[PDB]
Amino acid sequence: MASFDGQGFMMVDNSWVQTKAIDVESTTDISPYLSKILEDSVWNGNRSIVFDVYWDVKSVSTKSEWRLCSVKFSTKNFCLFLRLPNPFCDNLKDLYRFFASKFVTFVGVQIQEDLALLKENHGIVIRSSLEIGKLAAKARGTPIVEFLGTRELAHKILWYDMSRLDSIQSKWDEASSNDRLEAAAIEGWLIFNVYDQLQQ
Amino acid sequence: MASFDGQGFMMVDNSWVQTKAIDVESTTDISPYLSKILEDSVWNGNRSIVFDVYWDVKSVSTKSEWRLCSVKFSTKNFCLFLRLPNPFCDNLKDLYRFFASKFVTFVGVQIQEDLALLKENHGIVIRSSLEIGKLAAKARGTPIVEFLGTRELAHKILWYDMSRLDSIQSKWDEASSNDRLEAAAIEGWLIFNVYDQLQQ
Amino acid sequence: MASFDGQGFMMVDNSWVQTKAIDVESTTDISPYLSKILEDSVWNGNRSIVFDVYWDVKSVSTKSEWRLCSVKFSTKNFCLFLRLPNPFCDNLKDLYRFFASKFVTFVGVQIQEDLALLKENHGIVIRSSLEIGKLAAKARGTPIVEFLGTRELAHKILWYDMSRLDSIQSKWDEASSNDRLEAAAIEGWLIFNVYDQLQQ
Amino acid sequence: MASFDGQGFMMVDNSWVQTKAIDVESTTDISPYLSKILEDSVWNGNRSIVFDVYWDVKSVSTKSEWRLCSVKFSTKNFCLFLRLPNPFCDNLKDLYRFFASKFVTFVGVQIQEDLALLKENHGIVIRSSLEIGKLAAKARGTPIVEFLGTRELAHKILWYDMSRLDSIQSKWDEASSNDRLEAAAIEGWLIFNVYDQLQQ
Amino acid sequence: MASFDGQGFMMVDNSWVQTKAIDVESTTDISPYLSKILEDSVWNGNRSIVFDVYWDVKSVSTKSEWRLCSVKFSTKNFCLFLRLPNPFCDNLKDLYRFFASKFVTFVGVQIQEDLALLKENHGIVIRSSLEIGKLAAKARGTPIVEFLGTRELAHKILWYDMSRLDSIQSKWDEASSNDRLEAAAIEGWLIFNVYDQLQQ
Amino acid sequence: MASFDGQGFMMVDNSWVQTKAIDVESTTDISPYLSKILEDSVWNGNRSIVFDVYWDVKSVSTKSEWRLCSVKFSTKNFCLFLRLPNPFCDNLKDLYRFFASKFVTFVGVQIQEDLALLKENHGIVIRSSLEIGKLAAKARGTPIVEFLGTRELAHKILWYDMSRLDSIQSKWDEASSNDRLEAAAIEGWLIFNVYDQLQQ
């Protein structure tokens, strides 16, 4: 299959996240990596995929223009990181089709504005999504969690140690590429566990 | 009246689902098949028709264009699969009229975005629809049910065996067309039983 | 007054419903027939008028165009059927005035999309409508009733026999124009009774 | 002052409604009549004015065009009826300014669509309005009344006799100008009393 | 600092309200007067400022154009009345900046439509507003309070004497400009006390 | 790291707040200063960053144009003030990226209109915001708190002394730039504490 041969990281409960970052381009086939994510979601994930999307902004002095520059998919064992070109290449069809799948649910934190931007700027549609803060808010009856970011939401639901995460993110500008990737992988693993808890 | 002479499939409760997949051309008359679906819905389904819709995306490097390419209708005994052409032939107004029928209720999983895409891109309108996860959530007082995909919703409400489905969907990239049909038919049958349960 | 000289039908409680279908033309005066409907609604219907609208779709291979092709008005004792020309003739402003009336409440099943299409395509405005399912769902406290079509809703609220209706609709394509008229007459009658039971 | 010298009518509790119908035109000064309405609203009406608006529709074969053709203002002792020209004349400024007053509350029945049409087609804005069915729905906790027209709403709240009203409106097409006016005056008086009850 | 040397008025609780009405010209500096209002709001009003806005409508025979012509600001001790020119002079950005202040909360009666008109026609924006009837309704559990005008709301919550107000407003067409100011000042004082009551 | 070498201020609980105001230019690097804010937010602020935005309006005699002229970021220990040029310089995409961050939650008072103006005029998007009043209103069950400005909200939740703040703001026009900076610093500090008390 497709190997997630990038730098891995150990979480605070000893479990491991395998990573792969791909600079997608006209000739890159990401179907095997997406295939892996889905497989892991079906077997070991209760059909969830935690995701985040990252924007680049240009031409702010004129009329600011937002473009999706990368997306993260995290399952139980994997964290896939796709850096997207500008503009998209047609093979990214696969990504559009993936995001629209109902085989799974795309779990994210504060994603209201993202879903809008994805539609407006790229026509990317996510038919099966869950803004997990809203679900936590209802299920736990504690209204604050609707408004927390990834870390603080995870802290109110899981109370795991987040020392390493907090460390990397407090000095974000100085963090190496490997460090940035690690934080992303932790955030992924954290939200995966917030969902695991809310689904049972 | 009309013959569902494609590959049939056996569900985990030993009931048989008959199938038919059609490539709608300008000279194809789908009216006999919709009649069979309607007739089965009326006598054996409490006037529900399970549906899903499938999209192809084109031209994402410039301005993506979504387009409806297949629809699936399921009742207790039948699964109908229509593959649609680009563009539509004029005789597909039969399908438009069918979707707008108040004789039945079109039941689907996570269809909010679909309904929107059907209007914007085709002016297909569904006057009688039910997004089943919403109803289930409200009736069973378990909020998470609203944000689940087909399989995971079906699991929380029926607890039937889904090994076969999971097996097919986990390795979707390498599944035969016959396998994919089976998955679709199973999902149809599952959603139907979900509805059967919430309607009494 | 005007005469409902068309085919009458007996309901399952042995009460008679008179009908009239009209092919509205520029020379046709529908005012006596609306008058009769209105009159019956005031004396015998608690000022309810049950309605349904029917659409024709054209030009689906291109840019679909929806047009109101007929409307049905049902009271306790009458069912009026109006087939409408394309385009409307200018005397159809009598229908516009009627729909906008506050003398009555127009009762329909699953009419959200209908009201919208009536605005976009014709500027038909209904100032006093009731989506009967939404009201029943609230009153009876059975949330599913909001999403049922005409027959299935009537069943959960009335439990009258509906074998005749089911029989005609299950083989709709093979139903004579007289049979189809009867089915419409019955749905009207059924919905009138659902309203009757909820207004008291 | 301005005299309400038109045909008056006795209600079923013996009280009297004085009327005036005015065909407003470029040279008509309606300020004294509006002044009267406001006076009566301040003294004897708890600062309410019941209103209704009447539309004419044109050019239905083409693109239907709605224009406000008349408006009714009812207080405790008065029913003012203004027939508006096409187009408005500039002196109707006074009416725009009146409708925007916060000295009072404009009470009406099913006015959601009207407020939209008034804004879209004339830029008429009503800053202090009350759709009285919604208020009755809350206060009385009986959800049906949100959807009733003028008469049936009045019947559920007041249980006065409405024989004469029902009579006129069942044979609306045959009713003399005086008859039509009378119904309007009763509806006014009825809603005034529905409000009187809900305000104490 | 700035002198409110217009006609003062005595409220029914024997407290004195000082007034000032200004015709804002391009060389008028309203900043001293807004400062006084702010200062009084800060020390004696719990940072509330009562406001109303007044509209002139033009050109209704063709396409009506609404335009803001006066605003009133009230605190416990002061009532400021600004008559605005057509068009605005550039120095009215002071007023724009004042309305956008988060130092205070702009309290008004039935202001939903006003806020909309202020944006559409002037891009005046009020970041900190309170539609007081909404708050009152929610806090006192009496739904009707939301739909009341200034006087009638003030009556249901304070039960002060309003003979003077009622006297002036009932014969508004023949009230001196001094009388009209008094009415405005009184209304300001009433709404302020309404807020004083709901804020503790 | 970067130095907050501007005028520091003591709060009413004897804790020090360091400040820095910057006149952002094309050559100015704000990244160290945002880094410091972020760092303090992670270690000492439960990942909250308190913010306020300030607008300049132009061309009011014509068609008003709103432009973001400065923004304030407050944590437990720092207050950062950024005055922004017109137009923005292209390196301000660092501010865009920062506002869009999910590492933190941006906490503000009455920010509905702000978020909207930030979108219409600049495409500034805040993916993780909290309107603190709306949260407090829900938690404390005191509905008025949703509509209060910064000081009055802080008063109902904290009851700290605010004489210094009130003193500066009551004579705002006569306040030195140093005084105005202090007021902004305090509001930040106050809101931080309101958040602190609601997150625990």
Author numbering:
A (entry chain A), B (entry chain B), C (entry chain C), D (entry chain A), E (entry chain B), F (entry chain C): 1 to 200
From the paper:
To elucidate the catalytic mechanism of RICE1, we have determined the crystal structure of RICE1 at 2.9 Å resolution. RICE1 crystallizes in space group I4122 with three molecules in the asymmetric unit. RICE1 molecules form two donut-shaped hexamers that interact with each other in a face-to-face manner in the crystal lattice. RICE1 exhibits an α/β fold with a central seven-stranded β-sheet sandwiched between eight α-helices. Structural analysis of RICE1 using the DALI server revealed that RICE1 exhibits structural homology to the DnaQ family of 3’-to-5’ exonucleases including WRN-exo (r.m.s.d 2.4 Å to 2E61) and recently reported RICE2 (r.m.s.d 0.7 ~ 1.2 Å). A comparison of RICE1 with WRN-exo and other members of the DnaQ family revealed that the DEDD motif is not conserved in the active site of RICE1. Instead, the glutamate and the last aspartate residues in the DEDD motif are replaced by Tyr54 and Glu187. Notably, no obvious electron density corresponding to the active site Mg2+ ion of the DnaQ-like nucleases was observed near the active site of RICE1, despite the inclusion of 5 mM of MgSO4 in the protein sample for crystallization. Asp52 and Asp114, two residues that otherwise bind to divalent cations, interact with Lys102 and Arg127 of a neighboring RICE1 molecule. Moreover, the active site of RICE1, unlike other DnaQ family members, is located at the interface between RICE1 subunits within the hexameric ring.
RICE1 is a novel RISC-bound cofactor in Arabidopsis. RICE1 and RICE2 function as 3’-to-5’ exoribonucleases that specifically degraded ss RNAs. We also determined the crystal structure of RICE1 and observed that it formed a homohexameric ring with the active sites uniquely embedded at the interface between monomers. We propose that RICE1 and RICE2 act to clear 5’ uridylated fragments from RISC cleavage and to facilitate RISC recycling.
